[PDB]
Amino acid sequence: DQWAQQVLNYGLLIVLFAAVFGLLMQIFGSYMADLRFDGAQNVAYAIGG
């Protein structure tokens, strides 16, 4: 019973982290890929975001 419970625990962990981490890390990657130190973007806005 305990072994099955731990298997379920870590399976749910891997599912949740796969999905949510992929989504969040892709969003962060896109945002950082748009970042530029040109004269047109506010440095404070970009770093704060």
Binding site: S30, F37, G39, N42, A46, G49
Partner: protein, 57 residues
């Protein structure tokens, strides 16, 4: 005549001395201008009038 020729030669060397002083002043001015351009670029990057930021899409 030779004395006056040598005097003119001294005047020419004086003129070169003045020219070298002028060149040194111009060198200093050029360095100051390069620094001014650097600071203009820095101000342009960090200006608070900028309104852009990355977009989430």
């Amino acid at each position: 005549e030779l004395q006056a020729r040598i005097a003119g030669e001294q005047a020419a060397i004086q003129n070169e001395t003045t020219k070298l002083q002028m060149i040194a002043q111009l060198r200093q001015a050029e360095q100051a201008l390069i620094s001014e351009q650097r600071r203009e670029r820095n101000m342009r990057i960090l200006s608070s009038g900028n309104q852009g930021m990355p977009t989430i899409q």
